[PDB]
Amino acid sequence: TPVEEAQQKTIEAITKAINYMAKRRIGALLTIERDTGMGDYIETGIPLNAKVSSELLINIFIPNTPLHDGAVIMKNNEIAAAACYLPLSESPFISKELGTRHRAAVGISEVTDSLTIIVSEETGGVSVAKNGDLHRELTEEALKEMLEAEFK
């Protein structure tokens, strides 16, 4: 359908951006709203309401730029805002090997049904936070499967 094709385009854009950032070890934090509304978190960031593209996602997260710290939040197949605040998890089961981006991703995942992707600035490793759990060191195939499961 037109909307199934739009979803696949968004998945491709996300995975291309994530792959680029993983290769360069560019830290990134990208939350995808699901059924739990995240307007309160969107409002803490810089409003964009932009078309998704791999290029825009990459440009947002470039180190030492205005938009690179904080989360991108996507809603209805658009980038709602960048540089957003997310609540830090207080879970005692998050390794101290991991950074603030990962604790923020886990945190938002504890209070929403959203899917958050994280790229580590230390290793380029890619992880996903969902339902309070953090899935580490994801392959490209695994990330794609998660996104397809989430967008279905």
Binding site for a second copy (CB under 8 A): 46-51, 53-56, 58-60, 62, 65-68, 79, 82-83
In the complex with a second copy, the residue whose CB is nearer, 69 or 110, is 69
- Min CB(118)–a second copy separation in Å: 20
Left (φ > 0), alpha (ψ -120 to 50) or beta: where does 132 sit? left
Sequence-separated (6 or more) residues with CB below 8 Å from residue 2? none
Rounded CA-CA distance 87/103 in Å is 8
**Pairing between β-strand 71-75 and β-strand 28-32 as defined by DSSP bridges:** parallel
Q: Quick one: 62 or 142, whose CB is closer to Mg ion?
A: 62
CB of 25 to Mg ion, least distance (A): 12
Type and span of the H or E element at 135: strand 133-135
CB of 88 to a second copy, least distance (A): 23
- Nearest approach, Cβ of residue 56 and a second copy (Å): 6
Nearer to a second copy, 10 or 89 (CB): 10
